[PDB]
Design a protein around this ligand. Sequence first.
Ligand SMILES: [Ca+2]
Ligand SMILES: [Ca+2]
Ligand SMILES: [Ca+2]
Ligand SMILES: [Ca+2]
Ligand SMILES: [Ca+2]
Ligand SMILES: [Ca+2]
Ligand SMILES: [Ca+2]
Ligand SMILES: [Ca+2]
Ligand SMILES: [Ca+2]
Ligand SMILES: [Ca+2]
Ligand SMILES: [Ca+2]
Ligand SMILES: [Ca+2]
Ligand SMILES: [Cl-]
Lengths: 397, 400
Amino acid sequence: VEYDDSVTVGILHSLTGTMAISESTLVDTEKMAIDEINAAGGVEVDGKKYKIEYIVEDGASDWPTFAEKSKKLIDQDKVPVVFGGWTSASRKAMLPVYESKEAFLYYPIQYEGQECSKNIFYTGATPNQQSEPATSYMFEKSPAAGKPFYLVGSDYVFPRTSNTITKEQVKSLGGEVVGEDYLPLGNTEVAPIIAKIKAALPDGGVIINTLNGDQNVAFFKQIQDAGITPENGYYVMSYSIAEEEISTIGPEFLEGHYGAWNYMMSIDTPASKKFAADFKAKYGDDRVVADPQESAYNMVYLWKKAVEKAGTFDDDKVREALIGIKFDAPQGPIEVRPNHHISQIVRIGEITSDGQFKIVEESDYPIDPQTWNQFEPTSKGFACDWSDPSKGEKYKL
Amino acid sequence: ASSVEYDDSVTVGILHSLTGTMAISESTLVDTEKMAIDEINAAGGVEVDGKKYKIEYIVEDGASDWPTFAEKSKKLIDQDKVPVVFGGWTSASRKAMLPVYESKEAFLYYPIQYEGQECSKNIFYTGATPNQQSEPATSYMFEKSPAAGKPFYLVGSDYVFPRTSNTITKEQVKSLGGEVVGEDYLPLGNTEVAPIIAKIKAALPDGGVIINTLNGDQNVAFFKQIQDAGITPENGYYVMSYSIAEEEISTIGPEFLEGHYGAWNYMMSIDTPASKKFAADFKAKYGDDRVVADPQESAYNMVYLWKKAVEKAGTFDDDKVREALIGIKFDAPQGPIEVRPNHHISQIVRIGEITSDGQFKIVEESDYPIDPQTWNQFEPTSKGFACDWSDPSKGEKYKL
Ligand SMILES: [Ca+2]
Ligand SMILES: [Ca+2]
Ligand SMILES: [Ca+2]
Ligand SMILES: [Ca+2]
Ligand SMILES: [Ca+2]
Ligand SMILES: [Ca+2]
Ligand SMILES: [Ca+2]
Ligand SMILES: [Ca+2]
Ligand SMILES: [Ca+2]
Ligand SMILES: [Ca+2]
Ligand SMILES: [Ca+2]
Ligand SMILES: [Ca+2]
Ligand SMILES: [Cl-]
């Protein structure tokens, strides 16, 4: 397979520290997308085929390092796009770099919304594509239907914002929140929060888990040892771990708990089966795929389609062309919306003994993403639309 | 694409934790074993009786679970009939596997530093014995470290490696006239370290030596919580770790390990063509962020030593390969190694101080390769015993 020239893109993920358990597989999956596109002949611009090359930088689970590496990739390496980030902390540190330098970050991870950067595109779930339908499911259909919610997360803007939205949503459903605690990212001192869960949920109930990174390992092992188990009526709905982190922790610790995602490895379609089989072929029979990976995979194809539509790598024109791009993704059909996010089907999953999701609920159509939250009173009635100059980042409906 | 021509193939077993608490440590061993295989295959494969065999593999997940290591071993021996399994990390996993490889007269190649007190006819070992790791580390921490002369506190995982390691360390410290002022174990995978931290501060009021035999990802909680607790090199507390190296250091974060210590036969900072080639090849195959380390160098060496033994034996039959492997020499990334009559390898010893980048600064190195003692010469029940499988009158455990 021959190319006429090459283009270099940036990859920026935590390959070290507390977030490497989550972000490492994103680089594996981004490289799989790149290798696929290259094997099909690369990216066509103005009658030439460009091979996609990459520069991988280690964000090291450190938000200033994410900003510093973004500066390098934009100003030194002159990439037309960076594929990166996980924590909303890492994205918030990056956002002023990509805005001030009018560059382009593609960000794949489920998050709190309340954001619509001109210089960021998003393949992760907004709350109405994850926590909102999850909250309804846990409240109405889970084995802990009608029981109170206890909220536990990492101490930064994603879990705090997610839990603000969940508290407003649970008020609107007529449910109850009986606890809300944060641990520093990476911190494994979970014993005090376990004692509070047992006192606040004496008959069991719903635990909403927004812990990010490897502190999930201690969380799931210690709740089980304390008898906070599905057998005793305790069910954890997690937003920031899926099949990769389930398989690292050990599925014995996750069986009977729940997730809410747009992609799940258990989706039984030719597209989903091909994604899983190609990942295993590239990286080993043991390796899983999952929503974070599928989100990251899609960013590379959406970028490639926007480049070919725009007829250029210029991020100014590609960011304009990207709105309205469609893709037959492993999850099903996605479309980039005026707010820079994607429409996605929503799945609720019950974790099985093998660490896969059994899909217990699925939306009937792709849900259109709301970045400005319609439950949080300070964002309700606002929206984002970058296809209309009179609307933009944040306008009143 | 490849123009290399093979007559046939041989399928080997790879058996490591790709899931659960040991995956932080074992995952890179599969990466390294596969690099050695691809290197040998690119150079023409394994030559037996006029035929060139491509090495194929079957990877099984031990899942950080000792019964699973035993069951996957039974499958690889009895159903797959592999001529060799490269596998194991925890001495608990090895002990579960040992009766399977012995009973079935098969061949396990085991790469990880351990407690010795073992000499299976069905196992070869590329990891340090205590005289190639904990013994020289103990002397260094007691005599030359910034905590020279200060008491020792022992913390490890609750299984046969840390408990046996610490038995040897207690005997050695007594022989040097030092003090051990604590000894605590956590179940493997358990992150509840705060109680042990409180005992360290009470037992070592102005710092001292901590010997860390924790295995697997419980190391992450340990190093993060000790720093918050003021158990730091700046406060006179120095950890010497036997079961983590550059891979785990990079995953935990070097800010948590800087100024602590390791004892290993290979370190990525070794400044030789062989050491630099190993590191550069691993980054070329798996990414520029990827490190090499002793567990990986040990694993790499197993595949080359197996290949050399097959070519020496003139057959894949593990009985004859295990007989031929004694006496084999390899130019390894760490320097020259030789398989000894006790199925272990002679290795240079390095003591390293962890730098801000998570690399080792080598602060002591042996003048010669150290001959491995599997039967420990400080532990009273093993003192005066040795192993020699090359001489029929001696074998697994005989009086010197
Ligand atoms: Ca060019
Ligand atoms: Ca890593
Ligand atoms: Ca620009
Ligand atoms: Ca109610
Ligand atoms: Ca997605
Ligand atoms: Ca053009
Ligand atoms: Ca919106
Ligand atoms: Ca794994
Ligand atoms: Ca045999
Ligand atoms: Ca070794
Ligand atoms: Ca012959
Ligand atoms: Ca011996
Ligand atoms: Cl010598």
